[PDB]
Amino acid sequence: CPEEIRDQLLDFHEDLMTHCGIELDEDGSLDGSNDLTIRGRLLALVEKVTYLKSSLQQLISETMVRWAQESVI
């Protein structure tokens, strides 16, 4: 007997999900949240990263626009 006897062997023919591909197929299966409990931490780190980390950005933008405004270069 296999590991499970429910439908075919496991998890709705788990062989098709497992051994067809892991380089891209597994990552595509891990599309978003609510797959495992680690997705909350991953989303938290993603929204911390996507913070445009913001004093230098303001400084460079202000200096560039001021330089362009002051004179025709």
Side-chain angles (χ1 to χ4, degrees):
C1 285
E3 181 167 352
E4 211 180 11
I5 317 102
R6 275 201 191 168
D7 39 2
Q8 290 190 0
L9 313 160
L10 257 169
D11 211 331
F12 196 73
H13 199 49
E14 91 287 356
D15 290 344
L16 189 135
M17 165 297 297
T18 319
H19 305 289
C20 173
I22 301 101
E23 153 180 352
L24 188 51
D25 200 356
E26 186 266 339
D27 291 293
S29 72
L30 266 298
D31 181 83
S33 179
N34 60 41
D35 210 327
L36 278 85
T37 186
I38 60 181
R39 305 299 282 189
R41 180 259 303 147
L42 189 137
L43 192 134
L45 191 137
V46 161
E47 58 90 16
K48 292 285 104 175
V49 160
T50 318
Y51 200 61
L52 64 150
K53 65 106 170 181
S54 296
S55 197
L56 186 71
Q57 317 285 285
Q58 178 183 6
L59 164 150
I60 295 175
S61 196
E62 185 75 28
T63 53
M64 226 56 78
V65 302
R66 194 174 41 78
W67 284 2
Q69 279 160 255
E70 281 331 292
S71 63
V72 177
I73 45 177

